Amino acid sequence: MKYLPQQDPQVFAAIEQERKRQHAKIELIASENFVSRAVMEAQGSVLTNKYAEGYPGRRYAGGCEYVDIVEELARERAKQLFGAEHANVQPHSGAQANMAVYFTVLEHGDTVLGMNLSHGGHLTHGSPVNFSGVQYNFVAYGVDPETHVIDYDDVREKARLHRPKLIVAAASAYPRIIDFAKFREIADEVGAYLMVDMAHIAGLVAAGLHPNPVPYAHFVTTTTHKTLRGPRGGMILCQEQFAKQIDKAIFPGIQGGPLMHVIAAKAVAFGEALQDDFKAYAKRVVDNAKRLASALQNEGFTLVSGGTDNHLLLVDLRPQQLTGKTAEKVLDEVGITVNKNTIPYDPESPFVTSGIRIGTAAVTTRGFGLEEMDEIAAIIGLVLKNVGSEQALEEARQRVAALTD
Amino acid sequence: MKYLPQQDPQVFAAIEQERKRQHAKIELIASENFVSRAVMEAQGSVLTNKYAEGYPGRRYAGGCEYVDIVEELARERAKQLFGAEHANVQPHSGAQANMAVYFTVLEHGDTVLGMNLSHGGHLTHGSPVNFSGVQYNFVAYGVDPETHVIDYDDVREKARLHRPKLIVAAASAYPRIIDFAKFREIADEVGAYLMVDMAHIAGLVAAGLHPNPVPYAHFVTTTTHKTLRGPRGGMILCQEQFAKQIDKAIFPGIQGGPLMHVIAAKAVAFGEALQDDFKAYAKRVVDNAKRLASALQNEGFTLVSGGTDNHLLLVDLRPQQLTGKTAEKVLDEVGITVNKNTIPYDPESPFVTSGIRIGTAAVTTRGFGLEEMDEIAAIIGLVLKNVGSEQALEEARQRVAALTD
Numbered sequence: 001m002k003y004l005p006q007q008d009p010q011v012f013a014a015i016e017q018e019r020k021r022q023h024a025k026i027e028l029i030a031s032e033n034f035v036s037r038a039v040m041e042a043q044g045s046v047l048t049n050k051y052a053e054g055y056p057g058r059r060y061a062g063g064c065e066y067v068d069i070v071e072e073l074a075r076e077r078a079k080q081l082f083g084a085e086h087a088n089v090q091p092h093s094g095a096q097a098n099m100a101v102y103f104t105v106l107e108h109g110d111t112v113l114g115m116n117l118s119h120g121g122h123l124t125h126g127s128p129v130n131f132s133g134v135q136y137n138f139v140a141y142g143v144d145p146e147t148h149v150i151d152y153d154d155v156r157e158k159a160r161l162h163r164p165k166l167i168v169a170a171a172s173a174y175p176r177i178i179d180f181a182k183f184r185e186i187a188d189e190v191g192a193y194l195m196v197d198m199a200h201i202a203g204l205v206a207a208g209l210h211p212n213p214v215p216y217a218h219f220v221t222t223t224t225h226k227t228l229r230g231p232r233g234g235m236i237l238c239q240e241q242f243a244k245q246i247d248k249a250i251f252p253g254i255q256g257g258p259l260m261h262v263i264a265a266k267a268v269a270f271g272e273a274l275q276d277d278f279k280a281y282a283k284r285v286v287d288n289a290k291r292l293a294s295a296l297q298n299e300g301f302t303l304v305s306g307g308t309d310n311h312l313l314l315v316d317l318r319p320q321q322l323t324g325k326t327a328e329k330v331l332d333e334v335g336i337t338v339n340k341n342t343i344p345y346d347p348e349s350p351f352v353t354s355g356i357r358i359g360t361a362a363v364t365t366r367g368f369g370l371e372e373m374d375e376i377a378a379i380i381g382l383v384l385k386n387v388g389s390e391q392a393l394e395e396a397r398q399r400v401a402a403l404t405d
Numbered sequence: 406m407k408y409l410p411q412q413d414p415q416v417f418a419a420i421e422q423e424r425k426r427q428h429a430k431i432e433l434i435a436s437e438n439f440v441s442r443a444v445m446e447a448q449g450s451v452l453t454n455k456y457a458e459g460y461p462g463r464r465y466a467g468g469c470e471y472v473d474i475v476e477e478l479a480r481e482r483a484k485q486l487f488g489a490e491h492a493n494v495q496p497h498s499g500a501q502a503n504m505a506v507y508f509t510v511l512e513h514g515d516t517v518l519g520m521n522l523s524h525g526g527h528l529t530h531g532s533p534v535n536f537s538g539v540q541y542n543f544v545a546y547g548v549d550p551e552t553h554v555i556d557y558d559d560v561r562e563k564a565r566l567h568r569p570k571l572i573v574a575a576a577s578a579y580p581r582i583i584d585f586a587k588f589r590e591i592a593d594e595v596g597a598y599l600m601v602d603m604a605h606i607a608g609l610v611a612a613g614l615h616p617n618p619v620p621y622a623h624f625v626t627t628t629t630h631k632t633l634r635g636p637r638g639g640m641i642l643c644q645e646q647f648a649k650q651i652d653k654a655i656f657p658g659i660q661g662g663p664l665m666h667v668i669a670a671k672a673v674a675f676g677e678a679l680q681d682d683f684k685a686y687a688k689r690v691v692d693n694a695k696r697l698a699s700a701l702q703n704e705g706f707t708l709v710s711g712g713t714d715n716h717l718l719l720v721d722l723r724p725q726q727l728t729g730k731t732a733e734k735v736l737d738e739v740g741i742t743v744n745k746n747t748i749p750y751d752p753e754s755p756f757v758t759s760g761i762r763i764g765t766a767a768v769t770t771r772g773f774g775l776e777e778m779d780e781i782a783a784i785i786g787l788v789l790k791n792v793g794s795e796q797a798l799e800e801a802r803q804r805v806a807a808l809t810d
Contacts, residue, residue, distance in 0.1 A: 001446045
């Protein structure tokens with residue numbers, strides 16, 4: 001940086017703290033990643049200056065020739081990446097991508113079936129304190145109490161009983177592969193649209209390591225910043241038949257001017273995802289998660305669903321008589337970043353929880369491999385088995401420092 | 406840029422075209438500006454990597470100590486700038502800032518009174534193709550057919566007849582000062598909340614060149630990217646009594662994770678606005694607009710309301726028997742960027758219009774003054790009085806090039 005240090009010492013000092021934090025800590029938040037310097041440069045571009053309401057070749061203002069090129073690059077690379085008939089790269093966030101799909105096909109008070117929030121569903125899939133649960137009538141399907149795998153007979157029963165206009169598949173804390181074919185079969189039986197929110201698994205889908213929801217879903221929503229390793233924002237993929245309605249839902253429906261600099265960054269991230277090395281990266285993410293899962297089990301930990309098929313795992317801390325809150329706090333003390341997370345059929349409130357959610361996308365980006373996974377599990381074992389020993393926590397602290405150099 | 410040129414030639418070439426375009430053209434789009442290199446560096450920072458759902462000191466994830474410092478800097482500088490009791494700097498856009506206020510105080514189908522869209526109101530103030538007009542029952546107040554000034558007796562009559570739960574004051578194309586005191590008096594008479602959307606005039610308010618809505622309004626919404634000359638995004642200001650509800654409306658209500666890098670950029674822009682030279686800049690914006698207005702009138706143009714009190718003006722092209730669409734197209738041919746815009750009581754559709762909207766914020770930022778305003782008006786006169794002469798358009802082209810160097 002050149003101008004920010006002189007213009008704003010306070011903001012610069014805080015950013016530098018954050019930059020150093022990002023390097024020093026072991027980042028295991030499942031939703032996070034590290035973007036390339038190219039992605040950041042696009043975000044730091046003059047494209048922030050341009051109002052571009054509308055769409056490429058169909059804008060409501062002149063002088064968009066070049067931002068049109070950028071947006072089309074993003075849309076076309078997204079279509080190449082996921083095989084979608086249409087892409088909308090304007091959503092400001094995952095929240096707004098989901099909001100726009102709901103705006104497209106639902107009326108106020110319509111019934112929607114989504115994954116139980118305490119079983120892995122996202123806030124935007126029907127939380128009563130979120131617009132989704134306030135605006136629409138959300139019902140929930142659950143996972144099996146033993147296997148923690150989505151109960152597809154429950155999905156079917158809830159759909160047949162409640163008759164939703166829309167079914168939502170996907171999750172913020174589900175460590176197994178989702179059967180989109182089964183979701184579509186149920187959706188077809190009850191005459192419902194199928195929306196798949198692939199935010200967490202989008203990078204894995206792009207690399208062919210998770211089944212692609214695009215052929216089965218009417219609408220696919222995603223964030224660009226999780227496993228897809230792009231800038232912070234949203235995207236909608238859909239069948240050409242809904243293209244016009246989806247575009248109108250984003251604008252003039254729920255947003256105004258798009259963030260053209262973020263859209264530039266989206267294009268860059270999509271370009272990166274198209275490369276062979278991203279596919280190798282994505283395999284290492286899943287390989288690392290499976291290794292981390294096994295290594296944690298070796299340390300005596302119980303995992304929700306007994307392991308993972310993707311980038312994330314959920315530790316059930318009940319055998320250790322710890323809450324997710326206690327675990328998150330003590331790991332923070334040693335330099336490991338996780339989040340407390342509800343487990344299926346959690347006896348604790350979502351503000352306390354019986355679990356921690358862990359993902360490998362971020363550490364994999366930094367070059368961590370199987371040996372590092374073994375060590376991370378060993379450190380977690382050391383900490384959580386010795387929460388009252390400052391000696392153990394200091395050793396953990398040092399071993400964390402050894403991993404991050 | 407260092408990494409983007411190598412990683413993504415296509416995106417870089419398009420950004421460079423856009424950068425050069427921004428320098429070559431005379432940018433008169435009233436909603437646009439040019440941000441500082443410091444603002445852009447903040448947007449191009451590693452802060453994009455951080456999930457920070459929640460608020461400073463009250464986050465739903467650890468490791469936010471430093472992004473908390475950044476967000477508090479933004480909130481506190483905003484409070485210093487506008488004298489608000491509370492700030493929320495998380496809105497992704499003006500659209501989302503307005504959305505959150507509506508979410509806070511209204512239920513689906515509630516009556517809201519806003520400015521007639523064809524008289525200057527924004528899309529998010531009740532357009533039937535926008536969430537606002539679909540979700541709530543919007544009624545409209547108008548401007549006087551002769552003076553084009555808000556008819557406050559009409560505001561009062563509509564409020565007394567329709568009994569709105571909320572009154573919205575502010576505009577995307579209103580060139581005169583808005584009387585927030587009168588809006589609040591009407592709001593008090595009918596027992597309605599008052600929301601002021603100051604998006605366009607926010608920088609002028611910050612510099613004391615437009616009356617501050619904060620003392621009169623329950624909620625003030627704004628974008629950060631217009632006269633405030635910041636990054637693209639939104640903000641809500643409100644009385645402490647609504648602070649908790651407003652924060653919950655943004656999250657977990659209508660958004661998810663905030664854009665911490667954009668929030669950093671917001672803080673930087675607010676820091677810049679606090680400086681003495683921003684106040685001098687803002688005065689030049691208004692001085693330039695009044696000069697441009699006078700110079701256009703000298704060229705024989707009719708202006709909506711007979712001039713301007715702010716950064717923007719609206720040309721009524723009916724005397725010249727031109728549509729806004731025709732005017733926008735031909736000015737694009739010579740390197741002047743305007744937008745077609747409906748005039749009050751426009752006989753034309755909003756896709757054709759009888760007007761062009763012009764603002765001075767952008768050209769003022771680049772250092773244009775009164776002499777440049779005179780020349781811009783003269784060029785506009787030359788073009789619009791000679792739409793069929795390629796010779797005149799080429800001369801205009803050259804004179805535009807002379808202004809932008």
